[PDB]
Amino acid sequence: STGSATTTPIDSLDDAYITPVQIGTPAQTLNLDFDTGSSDLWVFSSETTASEVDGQTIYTPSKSTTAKLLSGATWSISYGDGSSSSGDVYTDTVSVGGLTVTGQAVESAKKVSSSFTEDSTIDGLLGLAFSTLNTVSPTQQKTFFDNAKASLDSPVFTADLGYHAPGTYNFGFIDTTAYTGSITYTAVSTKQGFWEWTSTGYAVGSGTFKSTSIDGIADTGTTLLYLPATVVSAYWAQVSGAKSSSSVGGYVFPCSATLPSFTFGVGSARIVIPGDYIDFGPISTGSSSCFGGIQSSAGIGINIFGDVALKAAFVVFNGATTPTLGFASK
C-alpha cells in the first residue's frame, strides 16, 4: 500500500504545515501537524476543556462506530517550545492520503496549552519520530508510520514541504518526479528517539564550505533552523545590522536586507536554503526589524533541522531495519 497527502502552510510565514487526516467511521477529517520530532497522534476532541478550544475541528469518538476506549491509558506531552497537552486514548481507524491503519492510538486531548488553543488551524499533531518517544502510559503506543510500515510497498515516508506553497507527504514510495538529481542518504541514530543525523558542514552565501560535523534532528514540527552559536554568528555577520536581541528572543535583522543563502552538507552533497526562506518577517506588525530563520541552538541541547532547512529539500525518512535519511534538491 501507499498514501499521498498534500500539506499546506498554516499562514504566510510557513509557521507550520497541516495535512488532512481521516479518523473514525464515518470519517472525521482533522487537519494535523505532521511532526517528525515527536511520536504522539493527538487531537482536539469532544473531551477537550471547552475554554481551550477556539475554532479547531474536534474528534468525537462517540460518533465513530470504530472507536474504542483504550481503558486506563493516559498521555501527557511537552514540546521544545514549552507547549503541552494531555488526555486519554482511543483506538480507531486512521487514514492519510488513502493509506489506512486500523487500531491506531488516537490520543484525545483533555487539556491543551495556550499556544495550541490560539492556533485555530491546527486540530492536533501526528507524530512521525520513533515510537520509543510515545508518551502513552502504562502501555506505550506506536506511531501511524510504525503501524503502517508492514503494509507499505517500501518502509519509507517522504516530506516535500513548500516555501509559501503546498507540498506533499508520501507513505510507502519515493516519487522520482518530485526531486532533481540524486538522493544522498546518511546514517541515523535512533538513540534519542529522533531522526538524528550528522551534517558534514555549511556555507554562508557564496562563501567557502566549512567541513564540520553538526549532529541534529530532522524535525518537520519545528519552524526554524537551530544550529550551534558559532555557525549562526557566522551567518548573521554577513547581514548588515543583524544582531541577537535578548528582548526579542533571537537574531533580528533590518527588514530592508537581502539575506544570503545558507548551505548545509549531506555527505558530499549540498542543500542550499535560499535567503528568502530565512526571512520570518517583522517581529511585530509594522516593525522594520525582522526575525531570522536561523537561530542558535545553545540551551536547547540539540541542533534542529526544522522546516526552514527541510523545505529546501526532498527528504526521505527511511524506516527500514537500519533507518537512514535521504536528501535531494528539488
List the catalytic residues: 35, 199
The amino acid that residue 63 corresponds to is: K
Residues 6+ apart with CB under 8 A from 249: none
Q: Is 75 helix (H, G, I), strand (E, B) or coil?
A: strand
How many Å apart are CA 86 and CA 64, to the nearest integer? 21
How far apart CA 234 and CA 269 sit, in angstroms, is 21
Q: Cis link prior to 138 (omega < 30° from 0)?
A: yes
- Please tell me the distance from the alpha carbon of residue 129 to that of residue 166, in angstroms, as a whole number: 22
What is the distance between the alpha carbons of residues 309 and 134, in angstroms, rounded to a whole number? 25
Query: How far, in Å, are 6, 22, 95, 206 from residue 25 at the CA level?
Result: 22, 9, 11, 54
The C-alpha atoms of residue 149 and residue 162 are separated, in whole angstroms, by 25
Cβ–Cβ < 8 Å for 17, 31: no
Burial of 185 (0-12, 13-18, 19+ CB in 10 A): middle
